Amino acid sequence: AARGHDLEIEVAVFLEETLAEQTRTISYNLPVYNVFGMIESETPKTLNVKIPAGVVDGQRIRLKGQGTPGENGPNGDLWLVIHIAPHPLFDIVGHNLEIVLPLAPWEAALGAKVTVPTLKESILLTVPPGSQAGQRLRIKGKGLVSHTGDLFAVIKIVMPTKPDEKARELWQQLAAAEASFDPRKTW
Template sequence: MAGDPYKELGVARNASADEVKKAFRKLAKDLHPDKNPGDKAAEERFKRVTAAFDLLGDKDKRAKFDRGEIDADGREQFRGFGGGGPGGFSGFGGAGGPGGRAGFENIDLDELFGMFGGQGRQRGARDFTPKGQDIRATLEISLEDSITGATRRIQFSDGRTLDVAIPKGAGDGQVIRLRGQGAPGRMGEAGDALIELKIAKHPLYRREGADLEMDLPISVPDAVLGGKVTVPTPEGRVSMTVPAGSNSGKVLRLKGRGGHAGGKRGDLLARLVVTLPEPQDEALTKFAEEWRTKRPYKP
């Protein structure tokens, strides 16, 4: 939105260079994005204040602006019909024309941005580049995708779609950075897209750190006599031996068939559940009746 750079900084038109600098320093600290994360209004105001100081912090540009020779974007004013006053003020990144950001020569960026993480000039210089904003999104993936890796497509609110490469062993909450896929910048350099991965709840497996837990139904004969059973894993079915005399609740471990955590692969823990046939088998019922009569026992 158009505005007056003096009003943006809150200084009078006859303010001294030191007063302009002091006003900018205070506003920049109060409005800096690191101090106001997620506050779009503060971010926009920060950009307008920055652009205002780009203009008023430079002695020559300020003088031309005051004489009506350039507008707030640093563009020369057309005065062929006797016009004169300063033009509109359009915000961040426009001031200075070919001169760029000369106004910041009078500001100690190390001192100004030292309060934001202690990164000094390196951080301050990066924050004043015309790079576009980063955008954030959440992508829900399956447990299998997180273990084996995959490529999944995500759609943003602006209608764009991107293919996201899910790395093998991806963790819940992991953020994937897609460089240059964020909002476009004023000077052409786009921000990044930050994609946070969320692993969906699985109908079969329960995650416990790097391990996966599951219930594995087995038949009465396999529980009594033992035998080979087929176990579904995130990477396909495998065969496992059930020991003879296995009760419900016994846990069998498949090494290296679990999830990932801390860079390590966990195990798959199969909890046995002895399951009766459906519908109920008459022969099994008769056998149970005779067993209860002749060989009673209490678990």
């Protein structure tokens, strides 16, 4: 008389439902064997499991005896391992969230106040003058919740498409203005 084996089901969970006390329907099969010992059938099972809120990524939950049938012995256990889903805007890094902050070059140079999204509502982040590409601007009070974490606005500089006659001239003049700038001092 030996016990059954443990099953594992990786449950993907949209980050947004992190603080959501959520219900997932789990479905799995338990194999049924021949007198000659091979599978010949699978019995289908389902449970409506109440997943607690604020389940951290990769965290584990145990449903005892929901695993494989024991031999002769107790059933094995079933494990639901969480895997927080890849957010469209935010990105889980540590206990904090990251948001890429697209900025037009003028916006980065002059500075600008622009609305940025959070978990729920949208705050107003201010960008200092002269900010650089890769700039890691922090916004406290908006981040993973449980205490609560912080969001980081990581600046990325974007460009409009090819410019028309007038916008061109201007660019040539900045080019002239900033002719001394070496964007590749590293090489």
